[PDB]
Amino acid sequence: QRNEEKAQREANKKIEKQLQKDKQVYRATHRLLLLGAGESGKSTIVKQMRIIFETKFQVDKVNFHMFDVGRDERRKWIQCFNDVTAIIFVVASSSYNMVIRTNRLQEALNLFKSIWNNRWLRTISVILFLNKQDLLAEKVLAGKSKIEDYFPEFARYTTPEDATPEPGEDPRVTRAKYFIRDEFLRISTASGDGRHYCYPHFTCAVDTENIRRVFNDCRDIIQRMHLRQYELL
Amino acid sequence: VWVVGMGIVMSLIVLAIVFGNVLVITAIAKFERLQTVTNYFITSLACADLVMGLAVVPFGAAHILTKTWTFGNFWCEFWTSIDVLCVTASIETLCVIAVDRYFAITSPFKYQSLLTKNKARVIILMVWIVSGLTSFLPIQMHWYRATHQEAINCYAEETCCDFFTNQAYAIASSIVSFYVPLVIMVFVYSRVFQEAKRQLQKIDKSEGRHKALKTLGIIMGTFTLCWLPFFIVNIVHVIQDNLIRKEVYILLNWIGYVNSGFNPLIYCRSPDFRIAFQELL
Amino acid sequence: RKLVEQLKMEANIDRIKVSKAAADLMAYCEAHAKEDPLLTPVPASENPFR
Amino acid sequence: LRQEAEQLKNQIRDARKACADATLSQITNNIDPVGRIQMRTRRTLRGHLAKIYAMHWGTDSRLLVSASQDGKLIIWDSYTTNKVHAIPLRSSWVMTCAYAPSGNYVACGGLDNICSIYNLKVRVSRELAGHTGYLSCCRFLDDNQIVTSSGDTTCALWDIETGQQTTTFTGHTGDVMSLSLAPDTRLFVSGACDASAKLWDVREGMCRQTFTGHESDINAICFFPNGNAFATGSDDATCRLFDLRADQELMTYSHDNIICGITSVSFSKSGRLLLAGYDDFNCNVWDALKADRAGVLAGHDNRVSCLGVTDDGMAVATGSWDSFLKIWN
Lengths: 233, 281, 50, 329
Ligand SMILES: CN[C@@H]1CCc2c(ccc(O)c2O)[C@H]1O
What we know:
The complex is a heterotetramer.
Chain B lengths: L1 H29 L6 H30 L6 H34 L4 H4 L2 H24 L8 H8 L10 H40 L4 H28 L7 H13 L4 H5 L3 H10 L1
Chain C lengths: L1 H10 L6 H14 L19
Chain D lengths: L1 H18 L4 H5 L12 E4 L7 E4 L7 E6 L3 E6 L5 E6 L7 E4 L5 E5 L4 E6 L3 E7 L5 E6 L4 E6 L4 E5 L5 E5 L6 E6 L5 E6 L4 E5 L5 E5 L6 E6 L6 E5 L4 E3 L9 E3 L8 E6 L5 E6 L5 E4 L16 E6 L6 E5 L4 E4 L1
Antiparallel strand pairs in D: 1-27, 2-3, 3-4, 4-5, 6-7, 7-8, 8-9, 10-11, 11-12, 12-13, 14-15, 15-16, 16-17, 18-19, 19-20, 20-21, 22-23, 23-24, 25-26, 26-27
The structure holds ligand G1I.
The ligand CN[C@@H]1CCc2c(ccc(O)c2O)[C@H]1O binds next to helix 3 and helix 7 of chain B.
InterPro entries (chain D): G-protein_beta_WD-40_rep (IPR020472), Gprotein_B (IPR001632), Guanine_nucleotide-bd_bsu (IPR016346), WD40/YVTN_repeat-like_dom_sf (IPR015943), WD40_repeat_CS (IPR019775), WD40_repeat_dom_sf (IPR036322), WD40_rpt (IPR001680)
GO cellular component, one term (chain D): cytosol
Keywords (chain D): Acetylation, Disease variant, Host-virus interaction, Intellectual disability, Phosphoprotein, Repeat, Transducer, WD repeat
């Protein structure tokens, strides 16, 4: 009879109301993906931000969710993360001399190239973190590992006068850090059509203000996305 | 033969307005990918422009060409009310679209929660309700009629039907319809331009190794140069001026009408809209 | 290691001529063609959806 | 060492070449073409929040299951378009879903590496864990056994009550992306990123045959209704139909226009029509015997992710990243 149809309609209405509530709850949550090598220091960034691994943290009453897929040389699940606001990329800038066999930093640059020139994620910005700044400073000041020996581009590289360095009190460490950042920026600029941007941040394990950096940067990402959607940028 | 040649312009304007608005309405209606929060406002604006282009443009053109109004007095009042309602709704929808854009850009994190489908429907219903009030209530109740002998004679005559209004109603209609939305649009677009300039400066600083100005300029120009002269002549001839000839007033009103053939194609320039238009035709 | 044994096991298997299997597939498609509403659309009365 | 492997490869290649007498094109060239086919969206469900990945028609030709990145596994009645059940998932990502032939159980799993199983008579009756990599596909052999394909390049045969891997089908290079079951529960095949589709026996647990025709990753596999053949979609534009008895390839379905890959492949009830999803917004059909495309299907807003043909053959349902299942007939 029609009693079964009426019961099914009532159940459908209840499920639709629950789905509307879930949509309201979920549309305000922003998804972030944490990507990096095992020795990069993603655990340190996760600990700093919190204070598959699912993490809830909110800034200014805005809920962000962070994912950590964690060998997987052929990344086939990278197409699953297509609705995330930004992808957090963590690389140890002090790992230029250490090589496993091809420097680890060069392998991270190749991974960044693969992520950037990905067909499935072409509107997904990348938040770049360079951990182990203190270790990089110690390595550069010591001079045991010549930066030009592993990266030949350092021989002709000059420090950027446009960017004011932090008070590191050493021109050499600033030059090395800015060269490492400029490598990623040069990879990002080649395919940059304005849809997605790469934001380099120099961070340290002692530093804990990375959460505000992520919040502000995600705000800028959404603002740029809206501006390009309305064709004002 | 001048009117015969002139009549072609009005026919072309009406055809263009109807075709553009129908195409836009079909574009949003047919494809579910186009439906969105702001596309509801866009389709409301398209509906208002279509209504005005269908109703008041042909009737006004016929009145101008024949130099007389064949239909009845009640139908003339209905035509005037429809004209006011459509103009007010169109400009208010422009203002609402500008406010939505400003809220989406300046406050992106809260933008998803601030406006939803229910919120957009409520806003559209409120806009149409206030437009319908401001149009019909002062007209159908004869609150806009003037005490001058010329206005009384014009109302008494069955054939001739021109627009005669009080200073108070003209001022109120102007401020409700155009002036307040003009202020709101200018403010929100100035804020949006400031945000865009800040973002461009930040991007230049970060990756040193415009378009926003052009878009805001074309939007503000096609709104202002189309409506502002008419809505300043409104107050001018309402308040202590007789130099405003009827021809100038009608010409500026028809420029305002022509704005309805310009709003769609500038508000549907997105690549998705172009793809939908290509698929439809 | 075990890959050599796996390939050796895979090598020794009975096979039939491709023509025979092709004819079998064609015969199956011809025989079961009638009992398929996808090839021949169902009448609106018979169609459960419409 | 590798000399024995090379000799075996040469022997199998020679055997396959010898067994290839006449291509199926030569035999089929004297058949009547299917002709143009018109497919219309009988019903649009449109109840999902985010992009959906997989769907599975129930044993009855009505009920549906579709899983989306929103984390909700929703059961749909195709005829009435009403939502029967909505089962939230503990894992935010679900890469696959399944419907048991009895209809009592529904299983889904994703990047959590756990094949969650829900009881419909919606609580988690059992959660199966033990896969190193992300899950990719799950199918029900019966009411008590399920085969899951994981990113650890291994597929396993599970027991619901026992909760442990009864048999592990190790010995595959790339990560398996899809699997299909024979009309009987005896045989099932899987395709991985190693450009190889291998046939497996559930009882013995050894790969009987290995087909490596493709040059790219396989993303979708379905059986011919006979059970003697199966077609594999791929990242390469070509979709190929293999043959278990002939041990070799039979056809490739390639067109000049299509530069995209394949996401879902499914046959018709009679086996004459091969339905293949695409990375392009629209799906394509293929005459399984003539290799000539019959008619392009209406596209979604985004890329399609799953194809399912009813057991009765009445309708086919396609789900894209636009969170829409459009029932076609
Ligand atoms: C047909 N002429 C009308 C008369 C006055 C008027 C117009 C438009 C908008 C308004 O707010 C008005 O008060 C004109 O289109």
